[PDB]
A paper describes a structure:
The α, β-tubulin heterodimer reversibly assembles into protofilaments of microtubules. Crystals of the α, β-tubulin heterodimer (T2), the stathmin-like protein RB3 (R) and tubulin tyrosine ligase (TTL) were prepared following published procedures. This protein complex, denoted T2R-TTL, has been used in previous structural studies of tubulin-modifying agents.
Over 20 crystals soaked with pironetin for times ranging from 1 to 24 h were screened and one crystal soaked for 3 h gave high-quality data that we were able to process to a resolution of 2.6 Å. The Fo–Fc difference electron density of the soaked crystals unambiguously identifies a covalent adduct at Cys316 of α2-tubulin (subunit C). The binding site is entirely contained within α2-tubulin subunit. Cys316 is found on β-strand S8 (we have followed the published nomenclature of tubulin secondary structure elements) and the pironetin molecule adopts an extended conformation that is perpendicular to the antiparallel β-sheet (strands S7, S8, S9 and S10). The lactone ring of pironetin sits in a pocket formed by the residues from the antiparallel β-sheet. The hydroxyl alkyl chain extends into a channel that is formed by the helices H7, H8, β-strand S5 and loop T7 that connects H7 to H8. At the secondary structural level there is a pronounced shift in the position of loop T7 (residues Phe244 to Leu259): the Cα atom of Val250 has moved over 11 Å, whilst Leu252 has shifted over 6 Å and Gly246 by 8 Å. The movement is a direct consequence of pironetin binding, as in the apo structure this part of the T7 loop occupies the same volume as the pironetin hydroxyl alkyl chain. In the complex, the T7 loop is stabilized by a contact consistent with a salt bridge between Asp251 (from α2-tubulin, subunit C) and Lys103 (from β1-tubulin, subunit B). However, Glu254 in this complex lacks the link to Mg2+ due to a movement of 4 Å of the carboxylate group.
Numbering used by the authors:
A (entry chain A): 1 to 247, 256 to 437
B (entry chain F): 1 to 103, 144 to 150, 159 to 166, 180 to 247, 252 to 361, 373 to 384
C (entry chain E): 6 to 27, 44 to 74
D (entry chain B): 2 to 53, 58 to 275, 280 to 428
The structure:
């Protein structure tokens, strides 16, 4: 098989991990103790779900995952929660003192203390894989651990596993739920240091998710639990072809342009008693609708380099092709000249899954689109502007310098983002 | 109170909207780079559309439509006419035009040149309609407000920007008799003030001199061009469903030929207004485009849902 | 609109739809990290020297 | 995790005692150390301030024994660790130099032994909070000597103070501006976060708003304890924002020296209708609700923390907090985006259903330092009362340095207000 190891870093990475691993278990019929009655090959197996779950002799399906945080609060909940029997204690790694919303404490000061330990625990999981494909790394841009420790870990992973793909799920910072004025700084520092180490990154803007929950789920004031459950559906659709039977050289034709825009439809509330069921055409259309995107930007004013669609549920290729045809002769889907104008399509017949007592209705059919569009640079421009405002006054910079960074890392990280913005602009205008 | 910022110090029109807003007592002007605004009156070059609609607790509105420059550059306008099936190569009210690059067959280059030899090369309208007295050329400027709902509002007042020189078939080198630009005129001011003849007079001239009306003979066509151009780009520029809203004021420029046919010459993204009409139009920009979105007629609404 | 690479199985299927044709070594990391430690150590010593005064 | 609390001098120990009364009640700890509450939220982060029935992690310091008897016999006096009472016999006589250099120097190593003991059994000590006045001798002079020593032993831990700033309206002595200026000098170099609790403000609230024609220290301290309860809510209960001292510092302090906060509280009391979320929000930002006597409209907010306590709509809080920034946007610096953070804790304080606490880093805090600086110079320029300080070994020059550093602090605040 082609195993994938998931690394969940910091509060955001861990709590999203809880949502994803809960969802995978429900999709695969794995109980919270790790038992999976449907799996008739005890002790091992070569099945698709084995990409994400190893097996013990006792019939137990164990995530190929490490959870890392510099303080124990969030992971202690995993250790005592409903999925505690699912993870071996050594997959759940904590320090005692966090990065205090400071990339530099994450990366340099606290980070150095726990890195060798984490790499060893990753190595244990890597040693259980007959043909490891790579890593999925979940983290916030804005936290000190999510930013600072993640960038340290990615550097080390290139050294220790150079031949291996590293994908990120990265939470971009939104003022309605953010906890630190310095999140722009942390976001640029981590983006800079990770750029050359990451093959593909899926950004989820907390603002986009927050608004989707308000607008489509009728949730007045969304919690992380609300946000993370929706995120987990996107994550599930993105990893589904790995975990089930089916079929970055699709999405990443330029090394640095590796941030595809995710869009998901339909998001419909559980409390909606009477819900009319959306067709293939309607859900495909919703994919080109800015309000369903994981990052709010306007794809009409950029260009496409690739689209991948994964449909889940009652979907046949004929309706997909018909919907796609009509899409071209209605929207502004301009591709770059050096790419084909076309869509990679996966269909998984299993209807999408919902966590019982969640907010998402269980629909007959859903779609997730990943499109590499220059429009996502809108998100960099916004973040870069905030960074400039504070950095001009050197506001908060002493917190970083006191941990051992130089000002130079700031301006060097910022100039890489200026270059990144330049790159996106050339491909898209 | 509502808040706005001001990013075009040079804008005649939105200099007047800012003044009108402030004298309401319900609009405060913030500093240029303060993001907590309801309304941006934007810069014309590189307006930061990607930073709009990310301020929780603020409905944000800007006075430009991202993407409308397709209509408002000569290069891109020709490409749009030619490649949109709504308009097409057969489109009967744009002059035959060609995009070309550096490094009676009478044409014009767009500093402008007019010849029968050889950034856009366009068929020069010989046989324009000439006002009398003075055997003289003009163009018509119509001002169009497209609001956040994509309502297309044509301001009922427009203006003829006239020539003051007899028109000359056999001498295309001399301008002023051929080019009707207010600047590039300034025998100026002879027949009407500032070479501006407004609609009451021109309608009267068309009645007295041609036995028709401005409405029948010119405006149906003006109205048709404007809705055709703007309903064409609507899917690309509309802000329905988007996380900020746009409006924009356009200047549409028309030639009328001697057979009282109308031709589209140019669309203008950042137009100025004629002195007399500043107050009226600028008020209507507040009434229809701003206070509609942020609550406290002189426009014709262009709409025509025909059945086939 | 050309539908290529059609793969089918029981739990799903996949295809393409064409509408139209067209690192630092471990030593560098440990170095970087150690230089930051050295700068924090210096800063700390500088403060303790001043507090000794 | 753990905070080590230190209270010094008369003022330090009176407001400190009140702090422990108020928070013990909020956490359901009675005066014998036992727990009797009905919410697991009260015990979840109990260890931040209490050792394990629950003993405060509190050290009580004075050069004068008077105050330490009256705390020991006060309501919660039973609850303190008896070995954590450390006291001299001599007093400091409202003299900074006595506290800092002569008499306090004698006592301080004993205090440090108690600190070291409490620290050594912390799972992961975050740092220290001190309560003290800056106008007297022990709290001011010895308290700042402590801070300096604590920094030498714990250079990487956060030092937080609640510093009661003096005013002629509630005045024990003319040398108060001397003592305060000498202490501000220390605080600027040696703390990470200082809450400026201004007796000028407290008096003015009691007199103008609460209608008390002669405010006692009890009345002033009733405001101080509500404020201390409020600003430490994010440390004591579960929550995302500013949940520890370092994270607060990182959110509140854009430049190391500008760490003097203007606290605010609503509703002001000494209560038959709960306030609406709009009224709390308007009031908490009002000049009349600030515990430092500065007009925030004479400056700009660098950073703001707002903590809401009680059962209320979190939507309404978010809407009202957005409302006040949007309508007063010029009073928030434009070069620090999203500089206002908001927490909401369910558990209200005693006797209120709804409350708001404000923590502002405003450039208008310069008004406070200027007032002290004016009173200082008036006396120092005639060398008045100096001989009480030179008689303890100090040099004039040391006063000159202190006045200088404070006038510098004012300039910087002004620089960022014009930026
Ligand atoms: N979507 C989502 N965002 C989160 C979650 N937890 C935190 N965030 C966001 O992530 C950022 C804060 O980073 P965290 O992940 O909490 O920080 P951390 O990695 O634990 O880092 P330190 O606490 O600084 O060591 C802010 O933008 C939060 O809104 C979560 O569960 N889901
Ligand atoms: N094909 C054509 N036939 C006749 N006259 C033409 C023409 N093209 C341009 N003109 C003349 O040139 C003048 C200005 O041309 P054009 O509209 O291309 O330039 P411009 O962009 O300066 C006008 P504006 O200042 O409103 O933007 C018109 O008023 C018209 O008289
Ligand atoms: N708010 C308040 N201020 C006090 C209290 N006790 C003293 N003060 C003030 O503190 C200063 C005197 O300091 P004090 O603590 O008595 O001196 P110390 O014992 O030498 O530390 C003066 O400015 C007084 O107004 C108190 O309980 N509350
Ligand atoms: Ca098996
Ligand atoms: Ca002695
Ligand atoms: Mg954390
Ligand atoms: Mg006293």
């Amino acid at each position: 098989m082609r195993e994938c190891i998931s690394i969940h870093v910091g509060q955001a990475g861990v709590q999203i991990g809880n949502a994803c691993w809960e969802l995978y278990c429900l999709e695969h019929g794995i109980q919270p103790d790790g038992q999976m009655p449907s799996d008739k090959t005890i002790g091992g197996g070569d099945d698709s779900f084995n990409t994400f779950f190893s097996e013990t002799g006792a019939g137990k399906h164990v995530p190929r995952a490490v959870f890392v945080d510099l303080e124990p609060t969030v992971i202690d909940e995993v250790r005592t929660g409903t999925y505690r029997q699912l993870f071996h204690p050594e997959q759940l790694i904590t320090g005692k003192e966090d990065a205090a919303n400071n990339y530099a404490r994450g990366h340099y000061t606290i980070g150095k203390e726990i890195i060798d330990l984490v790499l060893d625990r990753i190595r244990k999981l890597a040693d259980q894989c007959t043909g490891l494909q790579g890593f999925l790394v979940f983290h916030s841009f804005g936290g000190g651990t999510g930013s600072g420790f993640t960038s340290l870990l990615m550097e080390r992973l290139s050294v220790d596993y150079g031949k291996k793909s590293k994908l990120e799920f990265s939470i971009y910072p939104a003022p309605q739920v953010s906890t630190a004025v310095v999140e722009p700084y942390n976001s640029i520092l981590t983006t800079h240091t990770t750029l050359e180490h990451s093959d593909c990154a899926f950004m989820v803007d907390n603002e986009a998710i927050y608004d989707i929950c308000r607008r489509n789920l009728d949730i007045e004031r969304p919690t992380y639990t609300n946000l993370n459950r929706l995120i987990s559906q996107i994550v599930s659709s993105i990893t589904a072809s790995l975990r089930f039977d089916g079929a970055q050289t699709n999405l990443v034709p330029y090394p640095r342009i590796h941030f595809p825009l995710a869009t998901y439809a339909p998001v419909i509330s559980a409390e909606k008693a009477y819900h009319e069921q959306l067709s293939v055409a309607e859900i495909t259309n919703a994919c080109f609708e800015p309000a369903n995107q994981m990052v709010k930007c306007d794809p009409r004013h950029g260009k496409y380099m690739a689209c991948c669609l994964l449909y889940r549920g009652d979907v046949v290729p004929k309706d997909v092709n018909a919907a796609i045809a009509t899409i071209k002769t209605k929207r502004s889907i301009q591709f770059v000249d050096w790419c084909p104008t076309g869509f990679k399509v996966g269909i998984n017949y299993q209807p999408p899954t919902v966590v019982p007592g969640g907010d998402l209705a269980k629909v007959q059919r859903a779609v997730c689109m990943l499109s590499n569009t220059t429009a996502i640079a809108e998100a960099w421009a916004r973040l870069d502007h905030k960074f400039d405002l504070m950095y001009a006054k050197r506001a908060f910079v002493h917190w970083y310098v006191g941990e051992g960074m130089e000002e130079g890392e700031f301006s060097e990280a910022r100039e890489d983002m200026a270059a990144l913005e330049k790159d996106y602009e050339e491909v898209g205008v | 109170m509502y808040t706005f910022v001001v990013r075009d110090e040079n804008s005649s029109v939105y200099a007047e909207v800012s003044r009108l807003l402030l004298a309401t007592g319900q609009w405060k002007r913030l500093r240029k780079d303060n993001p907590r605004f309801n309304l941006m009156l934007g810069e014309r070059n590189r307006l930061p559309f990607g930073r709009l609609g990310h301020e929780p607790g603020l409905v944000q509105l800007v006075n430009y439509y991202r993407g409308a420059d397709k209509l408002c550059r000569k290069a891109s306008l020709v490409k749009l006419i030619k490649t949109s099936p709504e308009l097409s190569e057969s489109c009967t009210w744009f002059p035959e035009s060609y995009v070309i690059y550096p490094t009676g067959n009478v044409w014009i280059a767009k500093g402008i040149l007019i010849s029968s030899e050889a950034h856009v090369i366009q068929k020069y309208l010989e046989k324009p309609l000439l006002l009398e007295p003075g055997h003289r050329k003009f163009d018509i400027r119509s001002w169009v407000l497209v609001d956040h709902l994509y309502n297309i509002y044509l301001y009922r007042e427009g203006v003829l920007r006239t020539s003051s020189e007899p028109y000359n078939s056999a001498n295309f080198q001399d301008k002023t008799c051929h080019l009707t630009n207010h600047c590039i005129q300034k025998n100026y001011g002879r027949y009407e003030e500032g070479n501006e003849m407004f609609f009451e007079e021109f309608n009267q001239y068309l009645m007295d001199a041609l036995n028709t009306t401005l409405e029948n003979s010119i405006l149906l066509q003006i109205k048709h061009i404007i809705r055709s151009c703007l309903m064409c780009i609507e899917p690309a520029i509309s802000t329905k469903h988007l996380h900020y809203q746009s409006f924009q004021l356009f200047g549409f420029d028309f030639m009328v030929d001697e057979e009282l046919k109308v031709w589209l010459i140019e669309v203008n993204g950042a137009p100025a207004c004629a002195q007399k009409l500043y107050a009226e139009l600028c008020q209507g920009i507040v009434d229809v485009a701003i206070s509609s979105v942020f609550p406290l007629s002189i426009f014709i609404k262009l709409h025509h849902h025909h059945h086939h | 609109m050309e539908v290529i690479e059609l793969n089918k199985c029981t739990s799903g299927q996949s295809f393409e739809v064409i509408l139209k044709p067209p690192d630092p070594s471990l030593e560098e990391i440990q170095k970087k990290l150690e230089a930051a430690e050295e700068r924090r150590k210096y800063q700390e010593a500088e403060l303790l020297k001043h507090l000794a005064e | 995790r753990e905070i080590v609390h230190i209270q010094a001098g008369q003022c330090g120990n009176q407001i400190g005692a009140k702090f422990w009364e108020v928070i013990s009640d909020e956490h359901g700890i009675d005066p014998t150390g036992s727990y009797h509450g009905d919410s697991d939220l009260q015990l979840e982060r109990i260890n931040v301030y209490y050792n394990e029935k629950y003993v405060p992690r509190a050290i009580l310091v004075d050069l004068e024994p008077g105050t330490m008897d009256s705390v020991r016999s006060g309501p919660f006096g039973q609850i303190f660790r008896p070995d954590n009472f450390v006291f001299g016999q001599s007093g400091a006589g409202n003299n900074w130099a006595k506290g800092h250099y002569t008499e306090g120097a004698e006592l301080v190593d004993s205090v440090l032994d108690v600190v070291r003991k409490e620290s050594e059994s912390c799972d992961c000590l975050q740092g220290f909070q001190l309560t003290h006045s800056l106008g007297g001798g022990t709290g001011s002079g010895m308290g700042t000597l402590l801070i300096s020593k604590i920094r030498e032993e714990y250079p990487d831990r956060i030092m937080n103070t609640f510093s009661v700033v003096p005013s002629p309206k509630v005045s024990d002595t003319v040398v108060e501006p001397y003592n305060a200026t000498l202490s501000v000098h220390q605080l600027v170099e040696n703390t990470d976060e200082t809450y400026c609790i201004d007796n000028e403000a407290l008096y003015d609230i009691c007199f103008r708003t609460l209608k008390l024609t002669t405010p006692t220290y009890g009345d002033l301290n009733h405001l101080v304890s509500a404020t201390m309860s409020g600003v430490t809510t994010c440390l004591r209960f579960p929550g995302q924002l500013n949940a520890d001292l370092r994270k607060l510092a990182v959110n509140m302090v854009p430049f190391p020296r500008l760490h003097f906060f203007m606290p605010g509280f609503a509703p002001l009391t000494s209560q038959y209708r709960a306030l609406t979320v709009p009224e709390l929000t308007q009031q908490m930002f009002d000049a009349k609700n600030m515990m430092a006597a500065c007009d925030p409209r004479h400056g700009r907010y660098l950073t703001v923390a707002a903590v809401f306590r009680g059962r209320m709509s979190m939507k309404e809080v978010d809407e009202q907090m957005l409302n006040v920034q949007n309508k007063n946007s010029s009073y928030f610096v434009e070069w620090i985006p999203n500089n206002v953070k908001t927490a909401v804790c369910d558990i209200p304080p005693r006797g209120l259903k709804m409350s708001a606490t404000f923590i502002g880093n405003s450039t208008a805090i310069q008004e406070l330092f200027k007032r002290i600086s004016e009173q200082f110079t008036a006396m120092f320029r005639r060398k008045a009362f100096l001989h009480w300080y030179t008689g303890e070994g100090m040099d004039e020059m040391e006063f000159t340095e202190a006045e200088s550093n404070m006038n510098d602090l004012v300039s910087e605040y002004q620089q960022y207000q014009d930026a």
